[PDB]
Amino acid sequence: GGIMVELLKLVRSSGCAAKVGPGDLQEILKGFNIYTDESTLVSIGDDAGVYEHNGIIWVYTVDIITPVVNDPYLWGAISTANALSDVYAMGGIPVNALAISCFNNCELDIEIFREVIRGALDKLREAKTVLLGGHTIDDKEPKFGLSVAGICPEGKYITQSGAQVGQLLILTKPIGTGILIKGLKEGILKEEDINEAIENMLALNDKARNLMLSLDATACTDVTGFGLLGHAWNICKNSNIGARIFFEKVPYYQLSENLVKKKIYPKGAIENLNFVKNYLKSNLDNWKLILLSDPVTSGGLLFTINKEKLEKIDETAKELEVNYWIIGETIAENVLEVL
Amino acid sequence: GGIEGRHMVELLKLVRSSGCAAKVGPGDLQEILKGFNIYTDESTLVSIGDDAGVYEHNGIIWVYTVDIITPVVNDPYLWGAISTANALSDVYAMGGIPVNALAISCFNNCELDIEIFREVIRGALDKLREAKTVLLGGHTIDDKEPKFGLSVAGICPEGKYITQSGAQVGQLLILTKPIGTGILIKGLKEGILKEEDINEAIENMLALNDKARNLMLSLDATACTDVTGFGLLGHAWNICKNSNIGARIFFEKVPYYQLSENLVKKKIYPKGAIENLNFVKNYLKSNLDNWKLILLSDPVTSGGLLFTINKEKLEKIDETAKELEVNYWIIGETIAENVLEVL
Ligand SMILES: Nc1ncnc2c1ncn2[C@@H]1O[C@H](COP(=O)(O)CP(=O)(O)OP(=O)(O)O)[C@@H](O)[C@H]1O
Ligand SMILES: Nc1ncnc2c1ncn2[C@@H]1O[C@H](COP(=O)(O)CP(=O)(O)OP(=O)(O)O)[C@@H](O)[C@H]1O
Ligand SMILES: [Co+2]
Ligand SMILES: [Co+2]
Ligand SMILES: [Co+2]
Ligand SMILES: [Co+2]
Ligand SMILES: [Co+2]
Ligand SMILES: [Co+2]
Ligand SMILES: [Co+2]
Ligand SMILES: [Co+2]
Ligand SMILES: [Co+2]
Ligand SMILES: [Co+2]
């Protein structure tokens, strides 16, 4: 029956963000004896590795994802913004990159591949980051991403571990994209219906980085694959504190709520939920906890600041053209309290 | 009647035999990326096209490369270590020294298990330790077809980076590792061979190209690359095309595993060998038996360096190599006719 290209149908049904598990990940790595040196400032555990050389603080990160929209050009641009996000999350400036392309020449074709690259290039141009090469491998399930090298000007870098009790938790982009992507995959939604989320996914976190630094944030991370709760916990766990988050204060797309209540969501949201339930204190309905756990693609920065900094926050945000939402505060008890 | 309750896990059985023929040959991707408006800057010394990207910052010459491969053996630890040596190879091929890296892991938590994944990582870490390269992080994604590799950043001491573009007619072609691994890997995949039949090949795939880099720099090589996916003819051709010259390769001087020859003659070789042979068909001048051309076109994994040196360096090639403890084979010479002559 039934009276363009569909990339999503080439991804294994009912996904997440294709990642392979939360915290337990960086925990495996911890059990190994890794060669490191005097230049290694931050190794495994944060949004990016930090390495000093010739007096310069470089940051390095890599991220690859499966299709999140059916338009190849937009997938390329969004994946690029996603990879660059971790540089911004460290307070760094992207400098150069390499592309990692997994695609099957007969399950698609050069034309589609060229559109993904074009989207990536245009976003790198906007981020003034130079693509220096890459690698392409035959893969039935298409994936695209980048390894990125950046610099932290004047040697200042923001990790996930300096947060203090009594600080405000600030978020710069809404959550709920994973739900929308599941909606597109099932053919219930089209790109036009989620133009606002697409715009947020395409947006570079460079303006949020500036805002973040301007407010002298103590800790910072970006919200991606492990959901808002999982990424908030990384700050908590690394700073040895807790967080109280108010569901009512969290920005999300109305459509994400309508779909999630109809049990339409990526299986990844459930896995993220299950991982944090070991430190979660909440009596909210599950549709709320699934929404808060939902994998986010190219999400905003999540950081901590002092109330006192709220003085010129909206002014700063304005001139910078970046939104922000106060979603909660850090607490002494090492738990995640969602009210 | 006595079934092993213990699990098996054949990494090689999880690798797919693509039914799609390679459209991208030696240098094509570079030509393709030219039909794009790419943002670049004054610090970009070498962009898309060589073994690594070259970028200048306050006088420091950095090189960047990335490579990920599917399993080439069944041992997880060996696979991780080989993949690591393979990724570092491109930094060495530029004359650089690897500094730090990030790991890219594609694995299925249910068609394998954390324990095997830990073994891949352990092999990678031990090889990076040997390379004095710091692993700084990475990304892990769920994938039915296991894949593993690294993006690496290195530095070219004294600002000398060697490209595929500076060779000239009359120079000698030097290779530092045997070819033929693609055929051996195919034999392992078909259950014809076992790891124990290819210990020598495994040792070579595990070896870092650092000593070869020292030999290459000591002889002031004019051009260099490493032999990987496009086979010996294909990678030799990359130097030729970028240096606008041709090459004469003497099969009798080319190093390869005896088992690789026996296998090709019985048609046990990867389809990639036919695809690599097809890529160079319009520039190939040869009347050798075809098993020879197939072997010379066979995709190599974590291969050696391939570089050009002026004829007068021979006087010190041998003493320098013994000192450095690295093998080398003089397999040919560059020529004026932009053709690939295989004798
Ligand atoms: N295969 C691997 N090898 C080494 N380090 C790895 C790794 N996979 C992940 N890591 C590290 O383990 C931590 C968690 O990885 P990720 O979840 O990818 C962080 P992220 O990129 O900020 O989130 P995102 O993947 O949802 O975008 C990071 O420090 C990451 O660098
Ligand atoms: N997806 C991509 N985006 C940008 N550049 C890419 C790319 N894929 C490959 N390239 C570049 O195109 C040229 C050929 O790629 P490769 O064949 O991967 C070089 P190599 O790593 O030396 O060979 P190998 O892959 O057999 O190990 C290189 O300059 C590579 O950096
Ligand atoms: Co991150
Ligand atoms: Co990262
Ligand atoms: Co990330
Ligand atoms: Co490559
Ligand atoms: Co950070
Ligand atoms: Co190479
Ligand atoms: Co490379
Ligand atoms: Co390579
Ligand atoms: Co990641
Ligand atoms: Co080179």
Q: Where are the domains of chain A?
A: 1-158, 159-339
Residue B256: what residue type? Y
Query: Among partner residues A61, A132, A136, which is closest to B47 by beta-carbon distance?
Result: A132
3-state secondary structure of A139: coil
Locate the chain B residue with the closest alpha carbon to A46. B137
In whole angstroms, give the CA distance from residue B243 to residue B2. 63
Contacts of B201 (CB under 8 A, 6+ apart): B178, B180, B181, B184, B257, B259
Summarize chain B as % helix, strand, coil (round to 5).
Answer: 40, 25, 40
Q: Which of B20, B106, B224, B240 is catalytic?
A: B20
CB within 8 A of B46, min separation 6: which ones?
Answer: B52, B53, B54, B161, B163
Ligand 5: distance of its center to the CA of B117 in Å?
21
Closest by CA to B108, choosing from B72, B79, B145, B139, is B145
- The identity of residue A60, as a single letter, is Y
> CA nearest B269: which of B283, B290, B254, B249?
B290
Taking the centre of ligand 8 as the mean of its atom positions, its distance from the CA of residue B325, in whole angstroms, is: 22
Q: How far does chain A reach from its first CA to its final CA, in angstroms?
A: 47
Q: In b/e form, how buried is each residue of B170-189, taking b as 16+ CB within 10 angstroms?
A: ebbbbbbbbbbbbbbbbbbb
Query: Measuring CA to CA, which residue among A45, A79, A44, A48 is closest to residue A61?
Result: A48
User: In whole angstroms, what separates CA B6 from the centre of its chain?
Assistant: 36
The β-bridge partners of A58 are A51, A151
Q: Which fold has domain A1-158?
A: 60s Ribosomal Protein L30; Chain: A; (3.30.1330)
Q: Quote the CA–CA distance of B153 and B81 in Å, as a whole number.
A: 18
Q: Sheet containing A40-42: give its strands across.
A: A40-42, A49-53, A56-65, A143-151, A93-102, A130-137
Question: What is d(CA B336, CA B330) in angstroms, rounded to the nearest whole number?
Answer: 19
Q: Ligand 1 pocket, B141 CB below 6 A?
A: no
Determine the angle formed by the axes of helices B114-130 and B76-92, rounding to 10 degrees. 40
Phi, psi angle pair for B284, to nearest 5°: -85, 125
Closest listed ligand to the CA of B94: 12
**DSSP strand pairing (B340-342 vs B284-285):** parallel
Whether the CB-CB separation of B98 and B154 falls below 8 Å is answered with yes
Measured CA to CA, the distance from residue B143 to residue A18 in angstroms comes to 8
DSSP per position, A166-206: TPEEEESS-B-HHHHHHHHHTTS--GGGGHHHHHHHHS-TH
Unique residue bearing structure tokens 């298409």 = A142
Strands A168-171 and A325-331 come out as antiparallel
**Is any atom of ligand 1 closer than 6 Å to the C-beta of B124?**
no
CA distance A173 to A327: 12
Closest residue by Cα to residue B86 from B29, B13, B147: B147
Rounded to the nearest angstrom, the minimum Cα separation between B125 and chain A is: 6
Please state, in angstroms and rounded to a whole number, the distance separating the CA atoms of residues B65 and B333: 28
List the structure tokens of A79. 């994946």
DSSP state of B196: G
Hey, are the CB atoms on A18 and B142 less than 8 Å from each other? yes
User: How many inter-chain contacts (A to B, CB under 8 Å) are there?
Assistant: 201
Name the β-bridge partners of B62: B55, B155
Sequence-distant (6+) residues with CB within 8 A of B115 are none
Both structure tokens of A247: 């569901």
Report whether B285 contacts B342 (CB < 8 A).
Answer: yes
Structure tokens belonging to residue B179: 């070819």
Report the CATH number of the A159-339 domain. 3.90.650.10
Question: Minimal Cα distance from A49: which residue of B?
Answer: B136
Describe chain A by its helix, strand, coil percentages, rounded to 5.
40, 25, 35
Check: CATH 3.40.1390.10 for B163-343? Answer: no
User: Nearest to residue A90, comparing CAs of A58, A52, A60, A48?
Assistant: A48
Query: Would the CA dihedral through A37, A42, A48, A52 be positive or negative?
Result: negative
Amino acid, single-letter form, for residue A104: N
Say yes or no for a CB contact (<8 Å) between A61 and B22: no
DSSP notation for B67-80: EEE--SSS-HHHHH
Q: Which residues surround ligand 6, an ion (CB under 5 A)?
A: A 135; B 67
Rounded Cα distance between B279 and B190, Å, is 26
**Residue A245, Ramachandran bin (φ over 0: left; ψ between -120 and 50: alpha; else beta):** beta
Q: Which CATH class is domain B1-162?
A: alpha beta
DSSP-derived pairing of the beta strands A168-171 and A40-42: unpaired
Closest CA to B97 of B131, B120, B125: B131
Q: How many CA atoms, within 13 angstroms, populate the side-chain half-sphere of residue B339?
A: 8
CB-based contact A100 B104, cutoff 8 Å: yes
Elucidation technique: X-ray
B319 burial level (CB within 10 Å; 0-12, 13-18, 19+):
exposed
CA of A219 to the centre of ligand 7 (A): 7
Phi, psi of A208 (to 5 degrees): -65, -40
